[PDB]
RNA sequence: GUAGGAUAGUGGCCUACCAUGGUGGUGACGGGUGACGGAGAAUUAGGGUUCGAUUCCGGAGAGGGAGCCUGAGAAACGGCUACCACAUCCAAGGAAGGCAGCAGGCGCGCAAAUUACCCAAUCCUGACACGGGGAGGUAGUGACAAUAAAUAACAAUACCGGCUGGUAAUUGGAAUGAGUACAAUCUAAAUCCCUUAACGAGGAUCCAUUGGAGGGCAAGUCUGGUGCCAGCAGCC
């Protein structure tokens, strides 16, 4: 027996199962272009996401009211979307689970946030950011553009302290470039 | 009465072919520049893609 | 009529179980037979080269295809094994070893090659991919 | 980066921390020398010494 | 069924006598299985279909049978005895065998890794706090499978479409990891990861590939060659 072998993994995308529809291409090449994605299997994965939360609160609603089950289920399922932010406080019932979006989702994205609050010129500029290491969530460096930021987390986005635009220390270039202009 | 198909015929059109250099291009971005490249192609900017 | 009584489980499961043999992918599958093929129920085989041989294209087509007669190495049954793409025919010869997949119809003939239901993926070890585009090259010996 | 997580543990003694800590952890702390040892050898030098009988069996596993 | 023998014990388990009973289209008996069973895996309106050698549970085996000592516990095989099949050494008189354990080799095939390090973790075992553990772990190979995620971002100039957007191997400075390497860290000791002195990008040569462009099905009535040939074509 191989201890490692217990851990457990799983798949977080599906292939679309008409390749090739011409309206579903052109909506999947706007979202991208729109959010700066790098392929079609980060949407992909946004849309899994989406339709597994859209089952659970389809599921629980199918339940009767008073059963204890949809209870603890739908609160739990509507406290995570209001912790990430998806729904707001007066989205409290389990129907507002159901009309949500992809964009939604993709709104939610580091990336996204950084572009929206200032930081960035354009979403393009913000992911080389995210993934430059120029980004913090709170005190911790985050390098990944999918990170989900929660409501709570969002207003802590700052520059990265070790960095060159969120502290000193400049970069190899800007300081290749002192050395040969200090002669 | 003609020499219509044959085992040593094998590789005809190939070997006749004539052989063109392939012209020397710069690379396309890759992966999130190129969406966005083809984003601002068919969306931004603007028969089909290909036509004449 | 189908039979209705809530005691006629038995017979409606013996009759599906009947039934099914009707059914050709059924029969294919659970018959036994796959093991008498030239493959035995594998993907793949290896074989040796006896000899090339042109097939007249079916009608209304017109054209010699390029096969080769392959004796699989683990049963010894005699197949014939299409050659595709131009002029890959000169990438075989006598004695060669060639590794053979199926055609893609699951033990039927595709296109216009009458009773063909093999291809040639590899010779001498190297991918006939590999010498059509010049990537590779056939071992000498 | 600029944070780091450990375990530490402090003895009350130098004999206490040689009597309950792991030779390896000695070694680091240099209370303890290194020996170089190789298993594979020990078990052919035992494996041999097994077929000798007798105070001989002392250099029987040398070999 | 009666009475005994044997067994740790019940029992045609076996012996002696007695009776003719026992199963079967509600499929016995016989045959096949490329049949170990289950927990489970794949796909999911519902019902269903297919798979389950493999790390957990139960069973069986140690080349094929049979017999047996020791022992609480074995019909044990990294225990023994005999036959059968293979098979090493020999001074030819004899003597020794069991990798479906960890590596590794031959063969087989479409088809699967190093003859490495360690008891530091988990636990087992012995007289035993201490020894041992190819159980187990570490590291090597590893595009089975799964997760995240680079290959560029921004301005000036020139072109275009309506201050606003797209293009340019034109210009300009900024950013950074792939790599490289003190150091620390990690580690049973190493290695990897994380962190980080000094380096590390303009055709950013630090050059993305695999398939296709008649329809199914997204994409050329472009140009040259061939001319039912060569070839393409899952189907048409
Ligand atoms: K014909
Ligand atoms: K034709
Ligand atoms: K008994
Ligand atoms: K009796
Ligand atoms: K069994
Ligand atoms: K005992
Ligand atoms: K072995
Ligand atoms: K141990
Ligand atoms: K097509
Ligand atoms: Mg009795
Ligand atoms: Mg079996
Ligand atoms: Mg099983
Ligand atoms: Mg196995
Ligand atoms: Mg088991
Ligand atoms: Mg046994
Ligand atoms: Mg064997
Ligand atoms: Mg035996
Ligand atoms: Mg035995
Ligand atoms: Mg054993
Ligand atoms: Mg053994
Ligand atoms: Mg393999
Ligand atoms: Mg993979
Ligand atoms: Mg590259
Ligand atoms: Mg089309």
Redesign the interface.
């Given at each position: 027996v191989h201890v490692a072998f217990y851990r457990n993994y799983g798949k977080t995308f599906k292939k679309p199962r008409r390749p090739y529809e011409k309206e579903r291409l052109?909506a999947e090449?706007?979202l991208?272009?729109?959010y700066?994605?790098?392929?079609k299997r980060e949407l992909w994965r946004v849309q899994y996401a989406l339709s597994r939360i859209r089952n659970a609160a389809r599921m629980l609603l199918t339940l009767d009211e008073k059963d204890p089950r949809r209870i603890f289920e739908g609160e739990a399922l509507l406290r995570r979307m209001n912790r990430y932010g998806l729904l707001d406080e007066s989205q409290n019932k389990l129907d507002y689970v159901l009309s949500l979006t992809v964009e939604n989702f993709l709104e939610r994205r580091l990336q996204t946030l950084v572009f929206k609050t200032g930081m960035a010129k354009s979403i393009?500029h913000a992911?080389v950011l995210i993934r430059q290491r120029h980004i913090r969530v709170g005190r911790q460096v985050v390098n990944v553009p999918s990170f989900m930021v929660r409501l709570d987390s969002q207003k802590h986005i700052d520059f990265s302290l070790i960095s060159p635009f969120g502290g000193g220390r400049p970069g190899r270039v800007k300081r290749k470039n002192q050395k040969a202009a200090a002669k | 009465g003609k020499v219509?198909?044959?085992?040593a015929?094998?590789?005809?059109?190939?070997?006749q072919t004539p052989k063109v250099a392939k012209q020397d291009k710069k690379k396309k971005p890759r992966?999130?520049?190129h969406?966005?490249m083809?984003?601002?192609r068919?969306?931004v900017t603007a028969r089909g893609p290909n036509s004449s | 009529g189908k039979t209705r009584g809530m005691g006629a489980g038995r017979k409606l499961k013996s009759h599906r179980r009947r039934q099914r043999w009707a059914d050709k992918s059924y029969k294919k599958s659970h018959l036994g037979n796959e093991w008498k093929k030239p493959f035995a129920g594998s993907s793949h085989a290896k074989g040796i080269v006896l000899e090339?041989?042109?097939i007249?294209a079916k009608q209304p087509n017109?054209?010699?295809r390029?096969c080769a007669r392959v004796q699989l190495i683990k049963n010894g049954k005699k197949i014939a094994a299409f050659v595709p793409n131009?002029?890959?025919?000169?990438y075989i010869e006598e004695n060669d070893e060639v590794l053979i997949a199926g055609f893609g119809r699951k033990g039927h003939a595709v296109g216009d090659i009458p009773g063909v239901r093999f291809k040639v993926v590899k010779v001498s070890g190297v991918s006939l991919l590999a010498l059509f585009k010049e990537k590779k090259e056939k071992p000498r010996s | 980066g600029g944070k780091s997580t450990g375990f530490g543990l402090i003895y009350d003694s130098v004999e206490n921390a040689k009597k309950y800590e792991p030779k390896y952890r000695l070694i680091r702390n240099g209370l303890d020398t290194k020996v170089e040892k190789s298993r594979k050898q020990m078990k052919e030098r035992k494996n041999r010494a097994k077929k000798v009988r007798g105070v001989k069996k002392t250099k029987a596993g040398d070999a």
């Open positions: 052109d090449l706007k991208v272009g729109e700066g994605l790098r392929c393009h992911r | 219509h198909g044959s085992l015929r094998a590789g005809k059109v190939r070997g992966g999130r520049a969406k966005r083809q984003y601002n068919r969306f | 090339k041989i042109g007249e017109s054209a010699i390029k131009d002029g890959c025919l000169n | -």
